């Protein structure tokens, strides 16, 4: 995977917008994920009992997790591919502690793209979506590499 500097700038430009409302984007993304793929909700004992979108929107645990996810992802994206230091811990944790399959990472990537488009349609066009897709694909491929290294067939 390789993005042009221009593509990385499209990614960082839209992320600056995500940063103006991290919690809101986080909620939208996780709600999208849980509604699109209900099985992923089973991984959170703290709010796996959430059912309606109203319950999800009112959940402090869901909101907090969305902030954790986007804060971590933002740190990785800003490295423009040179994210070994930030990605290693995330990978090991997801493989040995959380046991998150690669397919789940694919699902959340879909949700991220969808929400960014929904909230920033005037700027998150085909070029930016393509760039973010490549960025998240690189992210997933590098996580998969760490997984395989530790024997976790996620
Ligand atoms: C993508 C991403 C970027 C930055 C940080 C994270 C943090 N993930 C977690 C942190 C603590 C505990 C659990 C985490 N992830 C759980 C999880 C559950 C279902 C589906 C997916 C897909 C998950 O990553 C993250 O998942
Ligand atoms: Fe996670």
Swiss-Prot record:
Residues that hold heme b according to the record: 94
Broad enzyme group: oxidoreductase
Catalytic reaction annotation: Fe(III)-heme b-[protein] + nitric oxide + H2O = Fe(II)-heme b-[protein] + nitrite + 2 H(+); H2O2 + AH2 = A + 2 H2O
Annotated gene: MB
Keywords: Cytoplasm, Heme, Iron, Metal-binding, Muscle protein, Oxidoreductase, Oxygen transport, Phosphoprotein, Transport
Name listed for the protein in its UniProt record: Myoglobin
Residue stretches making up the Globin domain: 2-148
Signal sequence bounds: none
EC number per UniProt: 1.7.-.-, 1.11.1.-
The protein's role, per its UniProt record: Monomeric heme protein which primary function is to store oxygen and facilitate its diffusion within muscle tissues. Reversibly binds oxygen through a pentacoordinated heme iron and enables its timely and efficient release as needed during periods of heightened demand. Depending on the oxidative conditions of tissues and cells, and in addition to its ability to bind oxygen, it also has a nitrite reductase activity whereby it regulates the production of bioactive nitric oxide.
